[PDB]
Write a protein that binds this DNA or RNA. Structure first.
Ligand code: T1C
Ligand code: MG
Ligand code: MG
Ligand code: MG
Ligand code: MG
Ligand code: MG
Ligand code: MG
Ligand code: MG
Ligand code: MG
Ligand code: MG
Ligand code: MG
Ligand code: MG
Ligand code: MG
Ligand code: MG
Ligand code: MG
Ligand code: MG
Ligand code: MG
Ligand code: MG
Ligand code: MG
Ligand code: MG
Ligand code: MG
Ligand code: MG
Ligand code: MG
Ligand code: MG
Ligand code: MG
Ligand code: MG
Ligand code: MG
Ligand code: MG
Ligand code: MG
Ligand code: MG
Ligand code: MG
Ligand code: MG
Ligand code: MG
Ligand code: MG
Ligand code: MG
Ligand code: MG
Ligand code: MG
Ligand code: MG
Ligand code: MG
Ligand code: MG
Ligand code: MG
Ligand code: MG
Ligand code: MG
Ligand code: MG
Ligand code: MG
Ligand code: MG
Ligand code: MG
Ligand code: MG
Lengths: 97, 140, 107, 190, 95, 166, 148, 181
RNA sequence: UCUCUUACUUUUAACCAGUGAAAUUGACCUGCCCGUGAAGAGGCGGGCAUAACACAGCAAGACGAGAAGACCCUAUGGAGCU
RNA sequence: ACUGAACUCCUCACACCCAAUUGGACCAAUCUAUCACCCUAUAGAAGAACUAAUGUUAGUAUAAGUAACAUGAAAACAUUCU
RNA sequence: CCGAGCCUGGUGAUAGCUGGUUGUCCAAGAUAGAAUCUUAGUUCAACUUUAAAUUUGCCCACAGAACCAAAUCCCCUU
RNA sequence: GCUAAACCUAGCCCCAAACCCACUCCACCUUACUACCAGACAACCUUAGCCAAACCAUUUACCCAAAUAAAGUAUAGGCGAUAGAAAUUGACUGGCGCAAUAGAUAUAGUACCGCAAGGGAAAGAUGAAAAAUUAUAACCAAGCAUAAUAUAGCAAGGACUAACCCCUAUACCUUCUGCAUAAUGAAUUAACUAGAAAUAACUUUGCAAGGAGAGCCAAAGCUAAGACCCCCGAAACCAGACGA
């Protein structure tokens, strides 16, 4: 049997947090601030994913270039094997040629 | 393990409630129940046609029994009632055979008379009068 | 399926229509929410159709209870002791009209 | 969605530990053929199509569209009586209960987005009220955005803000094609 | 072909297609006839002229070459004295 | 696990009005984790089903099974708590209403087969459950008489309706 | 996906492979259509219709010498020195309705484009712009931000 | 543990349903059941029977001696149905005796007495009363309403309709509800 | 050894008591004859047969279990040898 | 003459019977945004749905209480005997 | 389990070959051929599907299609 | 009513930030974990192959010193598959992550297996108090028990007063010209377990001879979005260790 026998603990949400209450602020900083910043400079994340999308193969190629030097060994190897697998999949396999 | 199915119980019971009168492990084990519940629902869908056919066959059998109790045959009764312009169907003819036997004897007599008038007309072959119950009310 | 469900014969409640027709619907209970998007057609039914329905069926008592609810519903109770609970969750006012009239016509 | 970085990552079969050897001979045993115990079919195996790495959801709407959305949101606030132009945002006390009673008397929403012109020159009174109020949020004009105006039932703008917004949102309509980014000088652009 | 390269994650051109065919900007592909510089002593002059013509390609072959080249080869090119400048556009073409 | 049989001997009933039948006594007893098979306990418990307490104790005293000895110990304990804690007057006025056996928590142990093969053995454990009710053992259901078979047949020849008509 | 084979298995051969027949893009013979394409010079056409339209809408000042900078600032031509653009060529289109005196500097000019500027009473001259210098004249502000 | 709330909520409503069909709750009067308004119920009773009852006379056709005495005991910690009940019962006997003896003129008197005593009997009168919302409006001490109390209440509404509408309209009701039986 | 097999003992066996596996298993309320049919039927057609249920024995069938045929063919699959 | 279909009529209603493939209309749960507050709404997302891989792990069956396993005898439990 | 040990790694080797491929409902829908170390596959054609644009499409009549049978092609009416 | 079933927390994942870890005593390169004796030896060599080229034999991307752009351009190449620049340009403390078959293999590199190199697990759940063990917790998988069975047949369906009897009905999936097939797979339950993206096209917004927040396209285009490309399985090949 795979169903809870009791109700789960209640999930109370503050829709008026500082984070929720100030989501989206300064997202028009360029068009409302004489184009001195960009919302892509407002993005906070990994250094290889600030203002760039990519698919998985493009993301793996991009991370190995910006930070493959300062990268742990096992995780670098795994990235090299991942790029090799994704090259073979995206260039040779599929239904549409 | 993000996004797992949490209502599979209710899906299994939606199938299983239609199997609880089955015999064996197919009344409780989903992998066998589904196979038998689809078949119970297909059989139900086709049994509508079979119900109509078997009910007509039953009416014809009962009408045959009652006509033979009056010495008449079923094709004779049916054909000569249509010739008498009586458009009672086989359901109500079996019903009259069961619940109104004097009415059914009157109908069997009417069909017998219509058959005798047909025989007289066939033997006469000329222009004798049509026959009292062989006249056809015309509609325009 | 028939072999898998209950059955009964054609019947009426108390020889209905022999001397007089009596409407078998007794009560219609309507739970509606004031702020719920599920209860929009139910709010519109209580604002425009329930009063004329009441006037057309004087033998039916219609209770309307506006309370916080996720699934608005209609509980139809009948002279023979029967209760029929139907959700009117996310239905338009025309569909609620059709459902309520169908409960008014059923025994 | 444009600033989203999803951080969910699973391991593929290649990245789960072990699993190099073939578990049991291809032929001879009455069992199913397997090449690795970290195959996606196996308990503790890799994930076939799972989330991969940190993943960016970054894209850019055209800036004319983004400015148009700003204009539309201002227009719908005016059209639905959720816009209040003010001379300045100075309050006589600096008290949250004063601000809430004021909004309740003036029949504003349960949430007010109060917008001044410049973060540096913001009246201390409002910066004291809008530091304990959670539903009453003060933002500089440079921070105006459609998401904030749709979360807040009411929008209190000032007159300097109104002029600022009108200038910045009509330059977009009477503007050329860029020829290089507008951070670089041009003849008539600040 | 290569749909995503390994150094730049991009689509690659088939340089065989580039070294054999010419794309007009209207979307037509131009080729030479096969065997135009081969065994001419056995070919008659009508056949030789037929082989010396510059001929167009199919819809199927055009879509195939457009897939085997990247978008750099489909841009408009304002060369100085291009002999195909006339043919880079269509005139009076209905449907 | 589940241990609901031992909470049944703790139902307090409301006090009885002076014009109602006396309400026989019910005593629930059971032994858990018996080193025996439930499929052999079944035959022992189906044999003592519906018997008097003394007749059951006789049959168990002369039966040859380990389970018969265990069920005798459980029945004697149940009789003792019947007239010690549930206010049964006579210790012979009891009968076995319910007598069943359930699976216990078992253990798995390897059984070395030949070649290189193994079998997993089960160290089987069982439960034995007994409900005693105050009173004489109820009269057994008598066999059907020819008169009862005929009356049933004629009821059915008289229950026949004309099918698929008005 | 289909039933079996390379289709359902996702292993069908590459684009241009025709099952083993010598493929079309291989059996056509090589001919130098695009031999030195990357070194061929390119000149964006500016018509006299376009120049007159720009002047009439006031995007190019006729009272000052018009050069490539004034034609990229008034946004009448877009020049890409990386796509081997070498400037603007003045072409004869709209020479019959050209009515404007101008001092225009281009990189290439037709006899009928020159003639029209000179019947209205203006001067046309053709100058050469090195690719780097062409970058400098078309976008003068990023060069001044390089500060060499 | 799986994430979510909706399946757990559905499972709890399923558990509550089975607990009810396992330890069923005691039968309770509709008056205690929540959605209930007595004056509206009385008016709807009259309107669905299509008769112009007088509301005070109807309300007294549902007030039994047992409610009076039990509510007096609850007061320790007005008019019954008796007069109306005896009028209704007597008119029921006379009207059905006349109906049956003009329809079936060759029946002996013993046969018409026994027919009148089946249509004015506990089983028929209780069936008709229960299926016409008389139990739901009967003010008494015990629930379910004892069959004698139900019979008294039913013939008291015939007494009320007699007093409110007349011996022809009441006679049409008797026809439509006791002859149909 | 056989014509041509018999007798006895021990093991096994069967019954009682204790302990307690394995392959196998779509679901089965799991019959015979002729015919049919993916060409050899418990399950389809026509006939016949038929209260229910253990224990022992047998090996004609369930194209019985086991082992993704060792033979033959194929694969722009391998490998050893010359 | 009659019987004889899902054919045709009749009462009412109609999008409601092909493989591969292709087009469309909906949609369970979950998370997020804003709602909603006995379990929902509008959208945004995604490890988003299993009667079948001699699938993987765990539980319990069938075979089956079957195959198979074990302790020389008496006695005072000192001993003695085979 | 030595026609070439075992373990780890490259390795998620490769498999035109078998097996598998998960909610509901409606709809359109059955294959002339050519190449190919190819015939257990693919590519092009044909057939099929969707979306657009336009004008004819099927059935067909006289007349008509070679010298050394049934029929077809063509084809206005309809 | 047994077996059971439920459960939120250990912890973990991706990032950000930030330069990480070694002398209680004693012992430890000999047969390590050994107080204490005549020696000395000593490090540096291009990976290869699977695979792709539908065989294969030259060839077949593997961070190498912040983004972008030039550009998949010049070039290279059985000129095939594919490979591919530069000048120049200008560049902290979170979670639309997992929650015990998941997330680390991890409760642990432990138990256990292997001579060795090496391989490698499983699992836990009261309460405020257990210096309250209390009976009100029960309800839910398969398997059983309560409670064996009754002519006849894919086990149902139409029915029926009536469980059966009567009539009708050749399991499913895959595979195939065609399967009730005596062709494949499956005892059953619970969980886990399989469609990833380009070139274009189409749809819907924006702006429009121009569009785009440098680079690029443009003889109505350009910008943005939406929407399409699976899982398991060999026998092998090569590199480095470990084994007589
Ligand atoms: C049964 N015998 C007569 C046999 C027959 C064949 N086939 C034929 O001769 C041809 N028969 C046909 C034509 C197919 C009907 C056979 O082909 C074989 C064998 C024997 C096996 C023995 C195998 C065995 N293993 C599998 C248990 C084994 O121990 C060895 C070994 N050397 O250790 C083997 O040799 C063995 O693997 C093997 O090779 C056999 C056969 O090939
Ligand atoms: Mg690995
Ligand atoms: Mg097996
Ligand atoms: Mg493998
Ligand atoms: Mg895992
Ligand atoms: Mg051994
Ligand atoms: Mg398949
Ligand atoms: Mg195929
Ligand atoms: Mg035994
Ligand atoms: Mg099998
Ligand atoms: Mg067949
Ligand atoms: Mg046969
Ligand atoms: Mg069979
Ligand atoms: Mg036997
Ligand atoms: Mg076999
Ligand atoms: Mg095989
Ligand atoms: Mg083989
Ligand atoms: Mg081949
Ligand atoms: Mg080969
Ligand atoms: Mg090879
Ligand atoms: Mg018919
Ligand atoms: Mg999935
Ligand atoms: Mg399975
Ligand atoms: Mg056996
Ligand atoms: Mg034995
Ligand atoms: Mg070895
Ligand atoms: Mg593979
Ligand atoms: Mg169709
Ligand atoms: Mg060849
Ligand atoms: Mg070939
Ligand atoms: Mg092939
Ligand atoms: Mg190859
Ligand atoms: Mg291949
Ligand atoms: Mg560079
Ligand atoms: Mg784990
Ligand atoms: Mg683990
Ligand atoms: Mg169960
Ligand atoms: Mg039958
Ligand atoms: Mg399937
Ligand atoms: Mg075949
Ligand atoms: Mg067969
Ligand atoms: Mg089969
Ligand atoms: Mg077969
Ligand atoms: Mg086989
Ligand atoms: Mg096969
Ligand atoms: Mg499952
Ligand atoms: Mg090789
Ligand atoms: Mg030795």
């Amino acid at each position: 049997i795979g169903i809870r026998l009791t109700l789960p603990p209640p999930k109370v949400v503050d829709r008026w947090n500082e984070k929720r209450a100030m989501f989206g602020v300064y997202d028009n900083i360029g068009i409302l601030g004489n184009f001195e910043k960009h919302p892509k400079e407002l993005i906070r994340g990994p250094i290889w994913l600030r203002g760039w999308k990519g698919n998985e193969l493009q993301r793996c190629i991009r991370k190995r270039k910006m930070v493959g030097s300062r990268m742990f060994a096992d995780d670098l190897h795994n990235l090299n094997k991942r790029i090799r697998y994704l090259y073979k999949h995206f260039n040779r396999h599929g239904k549409f040629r | 393990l993000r996004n797992r199915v949490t209502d599979r119980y209710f899906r299994i019971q939606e199938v299983l409630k239609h199997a609880r009168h089955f015999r064996g492990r197919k009344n409780r084990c989903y992998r066998l129940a589904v196979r038998t519940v689809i078949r119970a629902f297909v059989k139900c869908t086709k049994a509508r046609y079979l119900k109509k056919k078997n009910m007509r066959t039953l009416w014809i059998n009962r009408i045959t029994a009652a006509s033979q109790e009056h010495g008449l045959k079923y094709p004779a009764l049916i054909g000569n009632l249509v010739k008498c312009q009586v458009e009672l169907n086989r359901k109500v003819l079996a019903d009259l055979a069961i619940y109104e036997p004097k009415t059914f004897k009157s109908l069997a007599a009417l069909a017998s008379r219509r058959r005798h008038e047909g025989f007289a007309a066939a033997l006469g072959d000329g222009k004798e009068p049509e026959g009292i119950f062989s006249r056809v009310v015309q509609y325009h | 399926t028939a072999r898998g469900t209950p059955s009964r014969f054609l019947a009426s409640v108390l020889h209905n229509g022999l001397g007089r027709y009596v409407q078998q619907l007794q009560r219609l209970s309507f739970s509606v929410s004031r702020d719920g998007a599920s209860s929009r057609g139910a709010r519109e039914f209580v604002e425009r159709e329930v009063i004329d329905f009441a006037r057309r069926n004087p033998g039916v008592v219609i209770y309307v209870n506006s309370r916080p609810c996720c699934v608005p519903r209609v509980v139809a109770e009948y002279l023979n002791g029967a209760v029929r609970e139907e959700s009117i969750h996310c239905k338009s006012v025309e569909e609620i009209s059709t459902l309520v009239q169908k409960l008014a016509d059923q025994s | 969605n444009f600033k989203r970085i999803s951080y969910a990552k699973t391991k593929t079969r290649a990245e789960v530990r072990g699993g190099g050897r073939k578990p049991w001979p291809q032929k001879g045993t009455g069992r199913a053929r397997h090449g690795s115990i970290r195959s996606p079919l196996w308990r503790g195996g890799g994930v076939a199509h799972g989330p991969r790495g940190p993943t960016s959801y970054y894209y850019m709407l055209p800036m004319k569209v983004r400015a148009l959305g700003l204009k539309v949101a201002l227009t719908v606030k005016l059209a639905q009586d959720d816009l209040h132009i003010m001379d300045s945002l100075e309050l006589p006390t600096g008290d949250p209960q004063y601000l809430t009673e004021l909004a309740h008397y003036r029949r504003w929403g349960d949430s007010v987005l109060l917008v001044d012109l410049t973060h540096e020159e913001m009246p201390q009174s409002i910066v004291e009220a809008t530091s304990r109020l959670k539903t009453f949020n003060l933002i500089p004009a440079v921070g105006l955005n459609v998401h904030s105006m749709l979360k807040h039932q009411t929008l209190v703008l000032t007159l300097p803000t109104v002029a600022f917004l009108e200038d910045k949102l009509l330059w977009q309509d009477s503007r050329y094609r860029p020829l290089y980014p507008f951070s670089l000088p041009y003849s008539d652009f600040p | 072909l290569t749909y995503f390269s390994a150094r730049k994650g991009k689509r690659k051109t088939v340089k065989a297609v580039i070294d054999r065919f010419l794309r007009l900007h209207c979307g037509l592909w131009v080729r030479r006839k096969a065997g135009y510089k081969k065994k001419l002593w056995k070919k008659t002059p009508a056949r030789k002229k037929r082989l010396r013509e510059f001929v167009f390609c199919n819809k199927t072959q055009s879509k195939l070459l457009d897939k085997m080249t990247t978008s750099f080869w489909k841009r408009r090119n304002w060369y100085v004295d291009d002999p195909y400048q006339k043919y880079h556009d269509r005139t009076n073409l209905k449907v | 696990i589940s241990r609901k049989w031992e909470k049944k001997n703790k139902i307090v009933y409301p006090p009885q009005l002076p014009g109602e039948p006396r309400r026989p006594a019910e005593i629930y007893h059971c032994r858990r984790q018996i080193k025996y098979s439930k499929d052999k306990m079944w035959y022992l418990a189906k044999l003592i089903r519906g018997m008097s307490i003394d007749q059951a104790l006789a049959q168990l005293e002369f039966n040859d099974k380990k389970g018969a000895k265990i069920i005798k110990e459980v029945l004697l304990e149940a009789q003792d708590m019947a007239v010690r804690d549930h206010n049964v007057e006579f210790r012979s006025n009891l009968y076995i209403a319910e007598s069943t056996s359930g699976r216990g928590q078992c253990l798995k142990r390897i059984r070395y087969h030949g070649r290189g093969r193994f079998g997993i053995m089960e160290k089987v454990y069982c439960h034995y459950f007994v409900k005693l009710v105050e009173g004489p053992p109820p009269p057994p259901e008598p066999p059907k008489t020819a008169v009862a078979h005929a009356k049933e047949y004629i009821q059915q020849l008289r229950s026949r309706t004309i099918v698929h008509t008005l | 996906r289909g039933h079996k084979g390379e289709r359902q298995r996702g292993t069908r051969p590459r684009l241009g492979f025709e099952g083993g027949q010598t493929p079309f893009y291989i059996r056509i013979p090589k001919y130098g259509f695009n031999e030195g394409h990357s070194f061929r010079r390119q000149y964006k056409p500016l018509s006299l219709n376009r120049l007159q339209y720009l002047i009439d809408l006031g995007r190019v000042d006729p009272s000052q010498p018009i050069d490539l900078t004034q034609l990229v600032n008034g946004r009448g031509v877009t020049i890409q020195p990386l796509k081997r653009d070498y400037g603007v060529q003045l072409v004869e289109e709209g020479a019959d309705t050209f009515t404007a005196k101008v001092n225009i500097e281009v990189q290439l000019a037709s006899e009928l484009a020159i003639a029209a500027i000179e019947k209205n009473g203006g001067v046309v001259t053709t100058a050469f712009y090195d690719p780097r210098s062409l970058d400098i004249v078309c976008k003068p502000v990023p060069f001044f931000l390089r500060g060499q | 543990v799986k994430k979510g709330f909706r399946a757990a909520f559905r499972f709890q409503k399923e558990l509550e349903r089975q607990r009810l069909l396992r330890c069923p709750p005691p039968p309770v009067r509709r008056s205690e059941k929540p959605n209930w308004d007595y004056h509206a119920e009385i008016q709807a009773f009259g309107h669905r029977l299509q008769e112009n009852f007088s509301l005070d006379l109807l309300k007294t056709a549902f007030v039994n001696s047992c409610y009076i005495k039990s509510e007096e005991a609850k007061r320790q910690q007005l008019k019954s149905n008796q007069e109306l009940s005896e009028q209704g019962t007597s008119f029921s006997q006379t009207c059905l005796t006349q109906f049956l003896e003009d329809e079936y003129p060759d029946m002996p008197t013993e046969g018409i007495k026994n027919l009148v005593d089946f249509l004015t009997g506990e089983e028929v009168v209780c069936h008709v009363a229960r299926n016409l919302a008389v139990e739901q409006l009967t003010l008494s001490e015990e629930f379910p309403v004892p069959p004698a109390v139900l019979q008294q209440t039913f013939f008291a509404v015939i007494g009320a309709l007699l007093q409110s509408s007349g011996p022809e309209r009441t006679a049409l009701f008797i026809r439509d509800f006791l002859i149909t039986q």
